[PDB]
């Protein structure tokens, strides 16, 4: 999405579709490379009472 309008129009006519809506090259819409730190939850066996392994 940097080409001039003439090239985009000729490209859309030659392809037969609209390529500006769906571009195969990624841009600023992708997720950021840095993320806030997560807090993964625990499972169902992380309990202090009624957690006998034999059951």
């Amino acid at each position: 999405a940097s080409a001039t309008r003439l090239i985009q129009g000729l490209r859309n006519w030659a392809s037969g579709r609209d390529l500006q809506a769906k571009l195969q090259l990624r841009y600023q819409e992708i997720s950021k490379r840095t993320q806030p730190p997560p807090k993964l939850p625990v499972g169902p066996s992380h309990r202090l009472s009624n957690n006998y392994y034999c059951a």
């Binding site: 066996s45 992380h46 202090l48 957690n51 006998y52 392994y53 034999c54 059951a55």
Partner: protein, 230 residues
């Protein structure tokens, strides 16, 4: 013949009088887990791991010390037996240090093996562990008493086999320490064999320390030539 009939998991078997529950279960083929019991030492019964359940009885009995009688059915795989084992080993591992990567017993530790077998899968202990002061008993046996579980195989070996009578327990409660109470060297003919009969890594071999690991060593059965005993 004075053999009497007992039952292990419903299976009938003959036993001699005076037989313990552990020996009867071994004769059937079941190995009850144990820490303080030894077939060549006196019965102490101070670890409570071998607590097995006799049916039609509202208490668990110590299989390493209970003598069997006629008509007993022993349940070695019931629910309350496993509950008792899990509770006892949770208590055992409550104060054990996190020393497994820096331990020579790792890979051949009895505590690790029965923790995987009969123990639980997580720890509910949210308190602070204890720390026992180390001792010196010679340049053969390396002593780390933080890892000792007070099984008293030391005292029984030094009192009934080596005949030294120089090892004991000083203290009362959670601060009871197995040692010698003075700077005394445990020098004897059979002073290394305690390293064989320590279920934890409390007593290790000082020349062997920090050298190899039990899973990568090949075992070759051979004969000693150092004396004429063979």
């Amino acid at each position: 013949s004075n053999l009497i009939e007992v039952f292990v998991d419903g299976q009938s078997v003959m036993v001699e009088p005076g037989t313990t529950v552990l020996q009867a279960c071994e004769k059937v083929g079941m190995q009850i887990p144990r820490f303080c019991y030894h077939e060549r030492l006196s019965v102490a019964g101070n670890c409570r791991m071998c607590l097995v359940e006799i049916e039609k009885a509202p208490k668990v009995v110590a299989a390493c010390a209970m003598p069997v009688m006629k008509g007993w059915n022993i349940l070695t795989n019931s629910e309350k037996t496993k509950k008792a084992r899990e509770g006892v080993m949770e208590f055992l591992l409550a104060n054990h240090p996190l020393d497994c990567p820096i331990c020579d017993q790792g890979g051949e530790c009895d505590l690790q093996d029965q923790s995987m077998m009969f123990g639980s899968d997580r720890s509910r202990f949210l308190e602070g562990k204890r720390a026992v002061e180390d001792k010196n008993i010679g340049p053969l046996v390396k002593t780390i008493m933080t890892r000792c579980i007070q099984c008293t195989r030391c005292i029984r070996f030094a009192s009934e086999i080596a005949g030294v009578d120089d090892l004991g327990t000083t203290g009362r409660g959670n601060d009871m320490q197995v040692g010698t109470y003075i700077e005394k060297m445990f020098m004897s003919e059979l002073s290394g064999n305690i390293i064989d009969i320590c279920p934890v890594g409390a007593l290790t071999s000082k020349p062997y320390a920090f050298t190899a690991r039990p899973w990568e060593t090949r075992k070759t059965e051979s004969i000693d030539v150092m004396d004429a005993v063979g």
